[PDB]
From Swiss-Prot, chain B:
Disulfide bonds join 71-103. The record marks 88, 91 as: Important for binding TNFRSF6B. It is found in: Secreted. It comes from the Eukaryota. Coiled coil: none annotated. The gene is TNFSF15. The chain holds residues 92 to 251 of 251 of the full protein. This is Tumor necrosis factor ligand superfamily member 15, secreted form. It comes from Homo sapiens (Human). Residues 1-152 are extracellular.
Length: 153, 152, 153
């Protein structure tokens, strides 16, 4: 009755150059506020490490915000958030979830969240992580706006 | 085993202006239809008191709808926030929050907002959902706007 | 211990005969990739048959993708997705969840996902199916973009 589980909450995000056309990954707050990691759930190196094989329900919401770029017609821009796992086996990451949506707004600006949640079978030693299209667009402001979680079922 | 859990569906939700405030909490149906409360967890006037302390998964969708309003000008918006109120500390702490900027371009619009996340709630704590604008909230169907939680 | 659970994933999709005035259901992948069914959870005939009574968490995400339509302004277009529960008793469906949003996207094309999830009490033999407003709008391209799942609590 003490299954591994953790709810991570956003932070400012220390800028750290990433590969070109490569999706940046966020790092989080894991012990302050509403965040936490327990029952051997280890959040290390911007990774959420799995303490044991089994089926976990992982979820994450990422609120994006920005000034209207809206440019015929103009080909839409896109914001996207992806949750992926990396294993001992193929170091080649496997995308589990991906909420991607077109954005061609009007008005002073815009802002909206992308929430995904599902259940996958992970093996101990697996490392989860969220990635996003554009880091500068993630609202790091509030704790209840951008989060990431996972718990053994 | 069998632990606490519940699934509330939307209802009428009459208007108001009592106690003067913003981000009105919604009312739910705790039994009629797909709705239900079990294992010591009960709905009680906008709240959802937790029977047993432990880790919970709170979730909820609130379908919004309204007639398009002209809108470079700062856009209006919609938001839904789930709150945890505890007797120990008065100040209700916001757990979740989905805010979407609205600025349509047609007859009208609609679109739900869904939020799901796990938290470590305390026994005797009270959960409730709040929305930017109570009137925009759709009350037609129960599968459109719901709100629940269970003990993991 | 051994609780029923299954995570299904989208596939190209095969045209089906148009008979009644109803929502098209989706059929999926239940073994390859991130897909799976276990502990007596049976995926048969486009339905997710419930092995045991009790409470389940049903979830699904359908990423829609289309071409910009046109829109006293013009009434908006819309897309929907609804998880339906069909009982052994009355053959009449029972819409459990329902996600529907309008669309007037001003741009070349668009695309956006719709995620829904909730806990219900289901009986044995009961079936579950995901329906959509427009089949041809569903993005079947990736497994993580359109999925359907459920597990016992
Ligand atoms: Mg097959």
């Amino acid at each position: 009755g003490d299954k591994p589980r953790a709810h991570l909450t956003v932070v400012r995000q220390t800028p750290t150059q990433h590969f070109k056309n490569q999706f940046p990954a966020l790092h989080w707050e894991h012990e302050l506020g509403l965040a936490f990691t327990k029952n051997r759930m280890n959040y290390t190196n911007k990774f959420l490490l799995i303490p044991e094989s089994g089926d976990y329900f992982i979820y994450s919401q990422v609120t994006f915000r920005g000034m209207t770029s809206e440019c015929r017609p103009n080909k839409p821009d896109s914001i996207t958030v992806v949750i992926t796992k990396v294993t001992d086996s193929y170091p080649e990451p496997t995308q589990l979830l991906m909420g991607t949506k077109s954005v061609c707004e009007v008005g002073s600006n815009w802002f909206q969240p992308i929430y995904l949640g599902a259940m996958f079978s992970l093996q101990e030693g697996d490392k989860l992580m969220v990635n996003v299209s554009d880091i500068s667009l993630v609202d790091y402001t509030k704790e209840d706006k951008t989060f990431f979680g996972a718990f053994l079922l």
